[PDB]
Amino acid sequence: AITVNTNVTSMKAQKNLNTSNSGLSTSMERLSSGLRINSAKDDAAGLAISNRLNS
Amino acid sequence: SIKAEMDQLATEIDSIGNSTAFGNTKLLTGTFSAGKVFQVGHQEGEDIKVTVKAS
């Protein structure tokens, strides 16, 4: 099991780093503005309710 | 609005089920409902059975 053409250990390691980087990014923008529902990624029903409360 | 979100999540559970394949053989659509056979010895009867129910 000693190969020099594919490194599956690297493939799994790369995915974990991408997930941790994306989580760090989304936390900064929530902190920089102060809103949990920045986009429609988050609670779909929350933004609809908030719009009527804003009115 | 909440149902419009639940509805699309159920569509992907269908989509993963019909897509997951080993090169060209679909593994989650019931073709492995009655376990297939792999031979791991050098004589007849040395077999292992893998069963994957449809999901």
Side-chain angles (χ1 to χ4, degrees):
Chain A
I2 309 200
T3 60
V4 303
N5 285 271
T6 36
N7 213 33
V8 185
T9 317
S10 205
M11 299 223 181
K12 307 243 199 119
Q14 284 153 8
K15 204 240 186 197
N16 285 317
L17 185 45
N18 292 14
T19 312
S20 43
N21 197 33
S22 166
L24 190 57
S25 291
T26 189
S27 310
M28 260 160 213
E29 30 196 273
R30 303 221 270 270
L31 281 163
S32 69
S33 61
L35 296 180
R36 201 170 51 85
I37 324 185
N38 264 85
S39 325
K41 305 333 161 173
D42 300 28
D43 313 330
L47 81 89
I49 300 177
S50 320
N51 281 358
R52 305 164 217 156
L53 294 167
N54 207 31
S55 298
Chain B
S1 267
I2 302 176
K3 186 137 159 317
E5 172 46 279
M6 271 188 248
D7 213 54
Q8 304 228 18
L9 284 158
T11 292
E12 271 206 350
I13 296 168
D14 218 335
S15 193
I16 295 180
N18 295 337
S19 209
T20 319
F22 177 72
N24 193 15
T25 284
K26 316 291 192 70
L27 319 172
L28 295 203
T29 79
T31 187
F32 288 84
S33 193
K36 226 168 270 283
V37 165
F38 304 75
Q39 163 156 347
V40 312
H42 67 118
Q43 305 222 239
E44 191 53 27
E46 271 96 340
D47 313 44
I48 180 78
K49 277 224 306 195
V50 196
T51 177
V52 199
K53 254 282 161 183
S55 92

